[PDB]
């Protein structure tokens, strides 16, 4: 019944190709709208990483969200959020979304 | 020493080779070893994010603008295939920009 929407921070599963490895779970910032995400079972999302290094495509998250770490704006990727059991953690404010879209837009060569 | 540039159609081992349209520029791609690229498919299913490649480019079929992703191109042995026309690159950027909520 949950459909991720633009600005959602979701918990996403990943399972190493190597079956003996545990794998686990990473948060991701959703950029694509629920109008696309719901019917396709896909979404465009940016991974959140625990380790901030000052990398220029890092987008910091405000503490109140209780998602730690930074969004990697340039690591945006098509993901199947149903197969990866997306669960909502929080929603990023509009300003986070504008920073991620401005940096990613710059990299993709957007008008 | 090939570095993928924006508009390049490249082979990727993503052995098991498939074509892709590169959206990110060489200045980014060569420094990071990563790139933003959309996969190319043999066939139009006809859904809204398909951008058809013009006939006789040396690669055939359709760019999936909604399947854009960051990947390591160095490990996947990227080799240049062809160059998309300006209008195909702009159409892929238009459709992907709209999906990513850019305005």
């Amino acid at each position: 019944d949950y459909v991720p929407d633009a600005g959602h921070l979701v918990w996403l599963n990943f399972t190493p190709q190597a079956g003996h490895e545990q794998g686990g779970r990473r948060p991701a910032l959703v950029l694509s709208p629920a109008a696309y995400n719901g019917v396709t079972g896909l979404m465009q999302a940016c991974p959140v990483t625990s380790r901030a290094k000052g990398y220029p495509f890092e987008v910091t998250l405000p503490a109140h969200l209780g998602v730690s770490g930074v969004v990697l704006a340039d690591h945006c990727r098509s993901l199947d959020w149903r197969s990866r059991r997306a669960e909502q953690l929080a929603e990023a404010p509009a300003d986070v979304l504008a920073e991620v879209r401005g940096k990613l837009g710059s990299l993709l060569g957007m008008s | 020493d090939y570095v993928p540039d924006a508009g390049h159609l490249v082979w990727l081992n993503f052995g098991g080779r498939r074509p892709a349209l590169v959206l990110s520029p060489a200045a980014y791609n060569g420094v990071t070893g990563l790139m933003q690229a959309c996969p190319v498919t043999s066939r139009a299913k006809g859904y809204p994010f398909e951008v058809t490649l013009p006939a006789h480019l040396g690669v055939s079929g359709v760019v999936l603008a909604d399947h854009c992703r960051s990947l390591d191109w160095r490990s996947r042995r990227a080799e240049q295939l062809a160059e998309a026309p300006a209008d195909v690159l702009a159409e892929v950027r238009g459709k992907l920009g709209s999906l990513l909520g850019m305005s």
């Binding site: 996403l12 599963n13 990943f14 399972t15 190493p16 190709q17 794998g23 990473r26 396709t40 079972g41 896909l42 991974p47 990483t49 290094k53 000052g54 990398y55 220029p56 495509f57 990697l72 690591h75 990727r77 098509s78 993901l79 199947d80 149903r82 197969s83 990866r84 401005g102 940096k103 837009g105 710059s106 990299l107 | 993503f14 498939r18 520029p25 200045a27 980014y28 420094v31 990071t32 990563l34 996969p39 498919t41 999936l64 399947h67 992703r69 960051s70 990947l71 390591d72």
Partner: peptide, 30 residues
């Protein structure tokens, strides 16, 4: 955002490797 201003800040020290999403899942094309 100016891409050149962004690229100018990148160093071997702050570079992130490819984010590992493990195996292809469901309808992922790649």
């Amino acid at each position: 955002y100016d891409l050149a201003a962004l690229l100018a800040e990148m160093t071997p020290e702050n570079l992130h490797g490819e984010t590992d999403w493990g195996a292809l899942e469901g309808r992922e094309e790649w």
